[PDB]
Ligand binder design. Structure first.
Ligand SMILES: CCCCCCCCCCCCCCCCCC(=O)OC[C@H](CO[C@@H]1O[C@H](CO[C@H]2O[C@H](CO)[C@H](O)[C@H](O)[C@H]2O)[C@H](O)[C@H](O)[C@H]1O)OC(=O)CCCCCCCCCCCCCCCCC
Ligand code: CLA
Ligand code: CLA
Ligand code: CLA
Ligand code: CLA
Ligand code: CLA
Ligand code: CLA
Ligand SMILES: C=Cc1c(C)c2cc3nc(c4c5[nH]c(cc6nc(cc1[nH]2)C(C)=C6CC)c(C)c5C(=O)[C@@H]4C(=O)OC)[C@@H](CCC(=O)OC/C=C(\C)CCC[C@H](C)CCC[C@H](C)CCCC(C)C)[C@@H]3C
Ligand SMILES: CC1=CCCC(C)(C)C1/C=C/C(C)=C/C=C/C(C)=C/C=C/C=C(C)/C=C/C=C(C)/C=C/C1=C(C)CCCC1(C)C
Ligand SMILES: CC1=CCCC(C)(C)C1/C=C/C(C)=C/C=C/C(C)=C/C=C/C=C(C)/C=C/C=C(C)/C=C/C1=C(C)CCCC1(C)C
Ligand SMILES: CC1=CCCC(C)(C)C1/C=C/C(C)=C/C=C/C(C)=C/C=C/C=C(C)/C=C/C=C(C)/C=C/C1=C(C)CCCC1(C)C
Lengths: 34, 442, 341, 36, 81, 137, 334
């Protein structure tokens, strides 16, 4: 008996979800050549 | 009583596990010496000066006379490879002994053998271990004398002809010279022992130091500390570590200045020019350039009233002008042919500069030990293009940092050792707080 | 038991991150300021406002990436997304500097929210609100530097841009143009920050080195108990030590910890005031007596005159690239330069 | 000047010897707990 | 101590990692694509390496009007078509 | 803007013939210029004689003309002063002096062309920065 | 009862209002020599030819300076790193022109300040304290060694050591930026973090303790009279301060252990300032800040400026103006 979805759950995913996406976009960028 | 983050302090009285820690760490050192050499050799290109290539170990080997010929021209790479391999291989034996003694060997030694066991507080056993290591160190210093005198000599940047490997036949034994260095001022124009500028003196000093160290090793095996020494020191493992942290810190600062200033045992052919060298080389360069154009460099007054190319030092020696006036203590083999007894000689300057000297000065000027942390060569306002930071900047900065922290480590451990020896390293006894039994100050 | 009370109940529940009424202002605005800065520094340029690249996408690294200020031509426009400048075009909004105002304004309302949170939690817990009070110092700095300073100038363009090296550029600008190091209000801030850092270190070290022996272990941390009545270190021995080493010491733990609040807070407040002056170009640029003497006496030189030559260098050498809207063209022959360099 | 040099060499040697011999005079024992 | 589930107990749990070994890579790949497709350039207006200047141009296309600024950058972008 | 063939097109000789480099040759030449020449000629200046630069107009007024692949390849073999009156191989890197300038040892004939090409292309891209010094940094 | 032993007892006595000690025996003369020379020089020294170009800089009050512009000026570049005691000058007039007093002051100060640090160990031992307060002071001390000794050694001249004055300080830090790009150096960035963070945690700790003082007083008296020097009970409620601060962030970002908290207070600004002193000490050997000048170029190869290029334009204007008469050749290599 613990909740799964909390205010806590929301603040965490507020930050972590776009962090990864952002990390992926920045990884892709190391291979851009001019 | 120690936490995980001070967990190596759990080894203080486990002489066997502590042996393994030391010998395993010794393996790490030999591993890096070997691995780093092979990395440098794998990346080495002979047609490029070493100091355009970020090499710090090949230059130490070359300096011992291996792999190089006249000019520091690299002649044979195999000695480098050999040095790397033998170190790398030797680290497995030390790794083996270390993990054995740290994990499976007897935790403590003094029950297995009364020879290898020790108590930190046993002043006679400690001076005996000290003695053995002094002898080893003395042997090591003599190994360098043997190389220089009997197995091919050493690289001599001052060898007539641009530099070459030269066997040292007459090492300096005169103690007025050898110990004279130890009494010269550490300030400019003097340079304490950093000013040693010929290999005769280098080799002779290692003769003295080898004998001194062997002598003291025997001394300390045979004696016990006298009472004034017993009453002045703290006798514990931490105290002894603190003493050596202090000694290593002082040695690190010396090494820093050695590699920044000295171009004899760090030849500029391998390490690049010193800061002062590079700065002298720039004034040399434009003096050459301007004189070819017709300028009379001796009579040319610069904006300040001081000579544009040449001026006097405060003791009168004719020296290079501009800001490099600060570096007139510089001595280098490309420059000395121009010096007479009053300093730089105007008639040699007008008449006797050689192309090889023009070349060397342009080369050193453009390889001054200035560079960014990301290895962009030159002044800090320079654009990207040249991938270059001098080995001397890398060696000077790294060892200043390590020297500093070992001084912090000395203070840390010396204070702790004193407080643990007196019994208050863990805090003040509430029921016996010294200050509360002292009279008030006011 | 009306609904306002029900929501108060819910806002003020004890949970891993407290929410509060202040959370309604704080959390959206904090997240949006922070999100705007990560968004602009990853993807958004400064080409059209500044002539600069400024995102990871363009090849900048963490030191050079920035959310740059709007073009000088925008004046002090709020640069609302729906405003007459961007006319609702997200893309144009980004290219005109809209994320700068986005970040600065949501940041300002987050700061308020955060300080209201310090007030709200302190009232619910029953402690005095000195941590909110102390936080007035960061607020003063933020408003005066990011808001007041450029509002006194021609445009937002001249505020700090939100980036590591852009901030370094801001420091250098203030030296060349405002001679900001000469300003006594900055000097008091310097003393407040440096004296803060000293107090922080000397108080920490003193406590750790006048500890009572309350446990048997060599790690002294284990022998504290957050609910013990007893002081964990000796104020008495601490006071004799510092009286004998430095001549004076603290004797009063309350005064000491108030002084620790007082010093860095005041210092920041003083610097804020000086930047308000610079909003109006009201600088301490010069000493009149020095300039009169130096104009008349070409042998008179001080560190004050040496530093203004450097300011003069800075301005002429950075102005054309740093203010592209001015179309400064300085031919080589007008650039100030010493000999040879 | 040479009189000044002499004087300073002397004063300095004096203080440095006070320091060396002071710490040689059983400094570990001058604490409040365990004296040796 | 407040009633949410301890973090140490979530990130060691088998259920946790069953989801997040999908959700983490998907987001990392979603972000990749955002760049590799070119979409990031278009959403944000960010110049590509080939489109800061026109071929014989060395003028920055600096905005210089407040209320005509939108039209200005649109002009500079046709000067590259 | 991009590295179009028109920018990669440089004079081959004084006659007026021309040659179009590839991107490959250009970047080849840039790399080799950093290896062998930038220690003194970073950005088209000459750190040990700032009065002589690598701008196209300067090379053009050199004796013999050096604003072309032929003149530059020759210069790298047998460098002369600006008026052509004396050979300066003893103090300037050159294939003629690769014994004293070791970095020239492994430069091949096409390497020389890529280096000369870089020198003539870069002013077309960078403008007055090339050879202009810190004023234009 | 013997003479030497009674002297030793007074030197190391815990009963002197100010502790002397064996470190004190060197500290006191050297700091008196440095203090006295500084005060006299600041008021009345004549101008000093710092840069060795027969261009003397006026540093003292009687030669037309105020408190903000005055300084003891560094010794002459013509001297470099040569030792220049008084007795090496033909006369005091020469010693003054060439900047003798700077050398006297910095060597006496760095000595006395090193002994200051040792004196901190010593009295700690005489009082039964733990010993590492002196380790915290090594951070400021290392910083003073860097700007007065290390940077001169690496650049080859005390003329490039930090002036002893307010505007001289600024001159030093502007020239440093042009020659080393110190802003873009990670060790300086850690100094700022150590110093901003230090002032932050100072304010935090003071506001938290102050927020949780236990009511011992009335509204008409200073709260400070609620604590009596030497009382055994702690004077604030740490659980209340933990309870507020952990809810201001979350529980586990807050300290309930006062020992860890105060050790944190000590280590953050100390370590940051070690690194920034290490910054000056390694830029002394010209391992400079990150250089990203022209690091971004476009498809054709046009340079696309960043904020680092703007910093460079400002550094360039510092470079070309500083010591405007001292350079005859195109590169400022030290
Ligand atoms: C035990 C307690 C210790 C108590 C000792 C107190 C007395 C000594 C105090 C030392 C003061 C140091 C001043 C150094 C000045 C300087 O010129 O120092 C450099 C000198 C080297 O001198 C240079 O030495 C040169 C030698 O090179 C010459 O010779 C070479 C030979 O090839 C080349 O030819 C070269 O061109 C030529 O010039 C020249 O003489 C230069 O003019 C001269 O400047 O270094 C050297 O003496 C090497 C030693 C320097 C160590 C100094 C490091 C200080 C680190 C302090 C750490 C502080 C940590 C903070 C703690 C908190
Ligand atoms: C130079 C680095 C170094 C070395 C040599 C040691 C050595 C040692 N430590 Mg210390 N330690 C270090 C760094 C180091 N430590 C650091 C950085 C920390 C901070 C986290 C600690 C924290 C720490 C704690 C907390 C404790 C020690 C303890 C010990 C001792 C017992 C360890 C043991 O039984 O492990 C058992 C470990 C294993 C069985 C795992 C395998 C380990 C092997 C050796 C890995 C090596 C692999 C290698 C590739 C093999 C090469 C083989 C080939 C050459 C034949 C041992 C002598 C302990 C002690 O004092 O005991 C009384 C102890 O309690 N250490
Ligand atoms: C302690 C002495 C020391 C010194 C002076 C050098 C110096 C050098 N190394 Mg070596 N190196 C060392 C130790 C040392 N290294 C060690 C311990 C390793 C194993 C990790 C290596 C592995 C290594 C490799 C693999 C390479 C070098 C290379 C280089 C060169 C460029 C370094 C660079 O760009 O730094 C970048 C600067 C940093 C990473 C800064 C670190 C800051 C730390 C984290 C703070 C420390 C604070 C505390 C200690 C330079 C000649 C390169 C080279 O040119 O090869 C020919 C290269 O490729 N080194
Ligand atoms: C300084 C490092 C050091 C020290 C003090 C010791 C000390 C000890 N070891 Mg350890 N050991 C070490 C290194 C060290 N060892 C290394 C490097 C290895 C791997 C080769 C081992 C492997 C090892 C094993 C496998 C065992 C020990 C054991 C022992 C104990 C008995 C020694 C004895 O009677 O040997 C007999 C002595 C000899 C045979 C003489 C050896 C002569 C050596 C090899 C030549 C030395 C020359 C020179 C100094 C080396 C440098 C050469 C190099 C530069 C190329 C003793 C406490 C034993 C023990 O305690 O078990 C319970 C045991 O079983 N050791
Ligand atoms: C690793 C090296 C090492 C170490 C750690 C020791 C350690 C020790 N030695 Mg041994 N010693 C060594 C090498 C070493 N020795 C060698 C090679 C020799 C042969 C010369 C000796 C000869 C020797 C003798 C003859 C004696 C000792 C004694 C002692 C003990 C007292 C040391 C002491 O009080 O010094 C502290 C030193 C002083 C109080 C005076 C030193 C003042 C100098 C001038 C300071 C200079 C520092 C300066 C900043 C640097 C520049 C150097 C300068 C010359 C230019 C101690 C156990 C004593 C003892 O008890 O023996 C049983 C003793 O009488 N040692
Ligand atoms: C010969 C060198 C030497 C030796 C043998 C010791 C030995 C010891 N020290 Mg001392 N120490 C030293 C040097 C040394 N120290 C130096 C130079 C300093 C100055 C900073 C200190 C400062 C110091 C403190 C403050 C303390 C000790 C303590 C201790 C004890 C436990 C240490 C431990 O377990 O750490 C375990 C190891 C760790 C926790 C990890 C440390 C990791 C470092 C900080 C990171 C370095 C990162 C690297 C440079 C770059 C990263 C690159 C990346 C790719 C990974 C042990 C007796 C403790 C003590 O007093 O016990 C009695 C203690 O509290 N030491
Ligand atoms: C409380 C949280 C909060 C706060 C304080 C702000 C504050 C701000 N935002 Mg941000 N924003 C937020 C949340 C917040 N935002 C959220 C959750 C999002 C995601 C959707 C955004 C997205 C966002 C964007 C995209 C932008 C802003 C902008 C702004 C600024 C201008 C706001 C404005 O003009 O309002 C005007 C409107 C009001 C003040 C509302 C007043 C409400 C009245 C009292 C009631 C009227 C009721 C109605 C008429 C009755 C019915 C009518 C009939 C049809 C039935 C300002 C700094 C702009 C900015 O930063 O500019 C650069 C901008 O471009 N915000
Ligand atoms: C650069 C230095 C600096 C930083 C980064 C900083 C940061 C902080 N200080 C805080 C607190 C404090 N600061 C204090 C005193 C001080 N703080 C100082 C200096 C700083 N303080 C100084 C010198 C002092 C001494 C007086 C106190 C007394 C407190 C606290 O009580 C509080 C705390 O809890 O600390 C433990 C925190 C407030 C959290 C918050 O508002 O969340 C909400 C976040 C919001 C509202 C978003 C703000 C958005 C900002 C304003 C604009 C955008 C910024 C970009 C996203 C990032 C740009 C990065 C580039 C510039 C490189 C935060 C960690
Ligand atoms: C003791 C301990 C307990 C707690 C944890 C901690 C890890 C810190 C710890 C410390 C462990 C330590 C430091 C471990 C030491 C291990 C060491 C030094 C390992 C050394 C291994 C060396 C080996 C095999 C070398 C292999 C060499 C080979 C084939 C050479 C082959 C080669 C040759 C011959 C010609 C050139 C090419 C090539 C392929 C390289
Ligand atoms: C080998 C070589 C190669 C190149 C040329 C050269 C000729 C120079 C050459 C020769 C070099 C030679 C022979 C080097 C000699 C080095 C010598 C003798 C080093 C001297 C070391 C002495 C030192 C530190 C003494 C430190 C003393 C300290 C702690 C005293 C501390 C104490 C004091 C002061 C009071 C009481 C308490 C306590 C703690 C004992
Ligand atoms: C480098 C390093 C050393 C220490 C260790 C460590 C592992 C931490 C490490 C690595 C850390 C790294 C590289 C961290 C990188 C994290 C990054 C890139 C995270 C990015 C998070 C981005 C987020 C939320 C973006 C949120 C964006 C939002 C709201 C934007 C909102 C909006 C905007 C901006 C305009 C209006 C419309 C809308 C939607 C309202």
């Amino acid at each position: 008996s613990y909740p799964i979805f909390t205010v806590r759950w929301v603040a965490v995913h507020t930050l972590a979800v776009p962090t990864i996406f952002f990390l992926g976009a920045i990884a892709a960028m190391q291979f851009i050549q001019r | 009583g120690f936490a995980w983050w001070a967990g190596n302090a759990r080894l203080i009285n486990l002489s066997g596990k502590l042996l393994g820690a030391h010998v395993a760490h010794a393996g790490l050192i030999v591993f890096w010496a070997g691995a780093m050499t092979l990395f440098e050799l794998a990346h080495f290109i002979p047609e490029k000066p070493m100091y355009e290539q970020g090499l710090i170990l090949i230059p130490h080997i070359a300096t011992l006379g291996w792999g190089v010929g006249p000019g520091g021209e690299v002649v044979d790479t195999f000695p480098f490879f050999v040095v790397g391999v033998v170190h790398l291989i030797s680290s497995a034996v030390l790794g083996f002994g270390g993990v054995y003694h740290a994990i499976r060997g007897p935790e403590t030694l003094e029950e297995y053998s009364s020879f290898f066991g020790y108590d930190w507080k046993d002043k006679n056993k400690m001076t005996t271990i000290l003695g053995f290591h002094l002898i080893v160190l003395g042997i090591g210093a003599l190994l360098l004398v043997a190389k220089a005198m009997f197995f091919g000599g050493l690289y001599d940047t001052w060898a007539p002809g641009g530099g070459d490997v030269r066997v040292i036949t007459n090492p300096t034994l005169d103690p007025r010279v050898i110990f004279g260095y130890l009494l010269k001022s550490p300030f400019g124009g003097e340079g304490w022992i950093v000013s040693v500028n010929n290999l005769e003196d280098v080799v002779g000093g290692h003769i003295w130091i080898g004998l001194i160290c062997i002598a003291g090793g025997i001394w300390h095996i045979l004696t016990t500390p006298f009472g004034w020494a017993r009453r002045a020191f703290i006798w514990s493992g931490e105290a002894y570590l603190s003493y050596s942290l202090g000694a290593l810190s002082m040695m690190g600062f010396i090494a820093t200045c050695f590699v920044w200033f000295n171009n004899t045992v760090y030849p500029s052919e391998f390490y690049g020019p010193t800061g002062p060298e590079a700065s002298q080389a720039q004034a040399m360069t434009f003096l050459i350039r301007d004189q070819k154009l017709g300028a009379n460099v001796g009579s040319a007054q610069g904006p300040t009233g001081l000579g544009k190319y040449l001026m006097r030092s405060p003791t009168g020696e004719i020296i290079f002008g501009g800001e490099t006036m600060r570096f007139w203590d510089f001595r280098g083999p490309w420059l000395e042919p121009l010096r007479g007894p009053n300093g730089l000689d105007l008639n040699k300057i007008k008449n006797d500069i050689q192309p090889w000297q023009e070349r060397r000065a342009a080369e050193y000027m453009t390889h001054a030990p200035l560079g960014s942390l990301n290895s962009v060569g030159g002044v800090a306002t320079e654009i990207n293009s040249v991938n270059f930071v001098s080995p001397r900047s890398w060696l000077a900065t790294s060892h200043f940092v390590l020297a500093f922290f070992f001084l912090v480590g000395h203070l840390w451990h010396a204070g702790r050792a004193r407080a643990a020896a007196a019994g208050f390293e863990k805090g003040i006894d509430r029921e016996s707080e010294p200050v509360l039994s002292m009279p008030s100050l006011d | 038991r009306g609904w306002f009370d029900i929501l108060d109940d819910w806002l003020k529940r004890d949970r891993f991150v407290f929410v509060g009424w202040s959370g309604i202002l704080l959390f959206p605005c904090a997240y949006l300021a922070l999100g705007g800065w990560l968004t602009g520094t990853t993807f958004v340029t400064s080409w059209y406002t500044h002539g600069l690249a400024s995102s990871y996408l363009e090849g900048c690294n963490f030191l050079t990436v920035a959310v740059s200020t709007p073009a000088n031509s925008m004046g002090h426009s709020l640069l609302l997304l729906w405003g007459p400048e961007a006319q609702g075009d997200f893309t144009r909004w980004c290219q005109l500097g809209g994320l700068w105002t986005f970040i600065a304004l949501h940041g300002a309302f987050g700061l308020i929210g955060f300080m209201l949170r310090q007030f709200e939690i302190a009232r619910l817990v029953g402690v005095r609100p000195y941590n909110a009070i102390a936080f007035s110092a960061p607020i003063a700095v933020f408003v005066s530097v990011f808001l007041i300073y450029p509002l006194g100038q021609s445009s937002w363009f001249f505020a700090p841009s939100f980036g590591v090296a852009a901030i370094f550029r801001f420091l250098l600008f203030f030296q060349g143009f405002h001679n900001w190091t000469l300003n006594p209000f900055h000097m008091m801030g310097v003393a407040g920050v440096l004296g803060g850092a000293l107090l922080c270190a000397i108080h920490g070290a003193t406590v750790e080195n006048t500890l009572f022996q309350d446990g048997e272990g060599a790690s002294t941390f284990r022998a504290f108990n957050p609910t013990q009545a007893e002081e964990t270190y000796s104020m008495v021995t601490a006071n004799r030590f510092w009286s004998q080493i430095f001549g004076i010491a603290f004797s009063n733990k309350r005064w000491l910890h108030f002084f620790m609040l007082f010093v860095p807070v005041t210092g920041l407040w003083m610097s804020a005031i000086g930047v308000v002056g610079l909003a109006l170009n009201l600088r301490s640029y010069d000493f009149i007596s020095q300039e009169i003497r130096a104009a008349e006496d070409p042998e008179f030189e001080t560190f004050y005159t040496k530093n203004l030559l450097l300011n003069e260098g800075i301005r002429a050498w950075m102005a054309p690239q740093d203010q592209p809207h001015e179309n400064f063209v300085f031919p080589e022959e007008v650039l100030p330069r010493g000999n040879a360099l | 000047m040479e009189t000044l040099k002499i004087t300073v060499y002397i004063v300095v040697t004096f203080f440095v010897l006070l320091f060396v011999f002071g710490f040689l005079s059983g400094d570990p024992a001058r604490n409040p707990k365990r004296k040796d | 101590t407040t009633g949410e589930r301890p973090f140490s107990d979530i990130i060691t749990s088998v259920r946790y990692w069953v989801i997040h070994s999908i959700t983490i890579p998907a987001l990392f790949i979603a972000g990749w694509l955002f760049v590799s497709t070119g979409l990031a350039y278009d959403v944000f207006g960010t110049p590509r390496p080939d489109s800061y200047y026109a071929q014989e141009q060395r003028s920055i296309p600096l905005v210089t009007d407040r209320f005509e600024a939108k039209q200005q950058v649109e002009t500079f972008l046709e000067q590259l078509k | 803007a991009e590295l179009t063939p028109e920018v990669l097109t440089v004079p081959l000789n004084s006659e007026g013939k021309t040659i179009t480099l590839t991107e490959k040759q250009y970047l080849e030449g840039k790399r080799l210029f950093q290896y062998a020449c930038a220690s003194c000629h970073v950005g088209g200046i000459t750190k040990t004689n700032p009065s002589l630069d690598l701008r196209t107009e300067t090379l053009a007024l050199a004796t013999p003309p050096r604003d072309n692949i032929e003149g530059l390849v020759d210069y790298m073999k047998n460098p002369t002063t600006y008026d052509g009156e004396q050979e300066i191989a003893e103090v300037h890197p050159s294939l003629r002096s690769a014994d004293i300038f070791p970095k020239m040892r492994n430069l091949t004939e096409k390497d020389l062309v890529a280096i000369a090409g870089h020198i003539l292309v870069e002013p077309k891209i960078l403008g007055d920065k090339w050879g202009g010094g810190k004023v234009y940094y | 009862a013997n003479l030497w032993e009674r002297f030793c007892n007074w030197v190391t006595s815990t009963d002197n209002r100010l502790y002397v000690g064996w470190f004190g025996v060197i500290m006191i003369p050297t700091l008196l020599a440095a203090t006295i020379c500084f005060v006299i020089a600041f008021i009345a020294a004549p101008p000093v030819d710092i840069d060795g170009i027969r261009e003397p800089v006026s540093g003292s009050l009687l030669y037309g300076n105020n408190i903000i512009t005055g300084a003891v000026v560094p010794s002459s570049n013509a001297i470099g790193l040569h030792f220049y005691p008084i007795w090496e000058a033909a006369s005091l007039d020469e010693w003054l022109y060439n900047g003798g007093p700077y050398q006297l002051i910095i060597f006496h100060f760095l000595l006395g300040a090193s002994c200051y640090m040792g004196r901190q160990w010593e009295l700690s031992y005489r009082l039964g304290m733990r010993p590492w307060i002196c380790v915290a002071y090594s951070a400021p001390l290392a910083s003073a060694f860097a700007v007065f000794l290390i940077y001169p050694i690496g650049q080859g001249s005390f003329s490039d050591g930090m002036p002893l004055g307010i505007s001289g300080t600024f001159n030093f830090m502007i020239v440093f930026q042009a020659e080393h790009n110190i802003l873009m150096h990670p060790f300086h960035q850690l100094g700022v973090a150590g110093v901003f963070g230090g002032a932050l945690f100072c304010a935090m700790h003071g506001s938290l303790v102050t927020s949780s003082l236990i009511r011992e007083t009335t509204e008409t008296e200073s709260a400070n009279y609620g604590y009596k020097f030497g009382q055994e009970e702690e004077t604030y409620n740490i659980v209340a301060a933990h309870g507020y601060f952990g809810r201001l962030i979350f529980q586990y970002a807050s300290f309930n252990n006062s020992r860890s908290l105060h050790f944190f207070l000590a280590a953050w600004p100390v370590v940051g300032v070690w690194f920034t002193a290490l910054g000056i000490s390694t830029m002394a050997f010209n391992l400079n800040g990150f250089n990203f000048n022209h690091s971004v170029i476009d498809a054709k190869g046009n340079v696309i400026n960043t904020w680092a290029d703007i910093i460079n334009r400002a550094n360039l204007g510092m470079e070309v103006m500083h010591e405007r008469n001292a350079h005859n050749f195109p590169l400022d290599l030290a």
